[PDB]
Symmetry: C3
Amino acid sequence: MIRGIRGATTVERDTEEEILQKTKQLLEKIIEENHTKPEDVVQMLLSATPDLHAVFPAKAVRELSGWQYVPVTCMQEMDVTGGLKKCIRVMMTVQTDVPQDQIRHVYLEKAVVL
Amino acid sequence: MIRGIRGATTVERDTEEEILQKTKQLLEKIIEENHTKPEDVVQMLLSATPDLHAVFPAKAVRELSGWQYVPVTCMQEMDVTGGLKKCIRVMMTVQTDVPQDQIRHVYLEKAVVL
Amino acid sequence: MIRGIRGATTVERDTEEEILQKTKQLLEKIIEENHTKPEDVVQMLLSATPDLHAVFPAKAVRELSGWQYVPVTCMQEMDVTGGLKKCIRVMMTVQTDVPQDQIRHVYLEKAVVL
């Protein structure tokens, strides 16, 4: 079946180095936990709160071996009063047999409270 | 097959109570009209126009029994001049064998003009 | 499987005619490259950079023959420093078993740089 996998991390500052590292990690933990092979990934959406402008998060995807063909695009997360700042969110769509309740959704850094 | 189900509604005021209630009521109608069960939902994206800041509309999914594992995320709608103000829209991706031309899309409140 | 197909194009004026024409053109190119049938399309997302406001680009989909049931929604792209201005990007989800590395993504106008 096809199921979404969610993740979220935070950056300390709006630099390219930080954003690509926090995203790359978030992506490795998702892969680890859910055994995602790049070819089972339908598409990925990455969003970032309105305070992040230094690089597209999508750039870290093509720093993973075998991931250069997975289609990824980015969106601006809505601005909510009191929402977690400098937060990058991923919604990955994958072909999996794993049941809905057993998907490992990943929250790292300041996102551990989402 | 897996198909997308669209919906839209509007709130009168940017208030958490108004946003969660009008969103819950739209999700309930989509679900009703299409006999959707939580385990068949791949994922769900909810958008809000740039004038709504009180709460993330995804907080309303919390009040639908059984939906606790359905992965949902939000995005900001683009700002079009003359677009419907105070509008929440949904794209729900479900596993279904209903023909494309028979998916029931739901437009409520002022969004009935879309 | 179901696979995402990415596209991107740019406009010269933020105007209804130019955003509708360049988006129609992007979509007609994706369909011809991927030999897409509307019944096989799960859904589609279109994002626009923060400088485009004249019309939603989703409106170009009703100019395509037979696409009146395809569920589409828009979203706002994040504003990246050094990013492509006046850019319209699409993520189309389709049912297909063409392997991932053989999907044809389309980059028109100033997006040929990608």
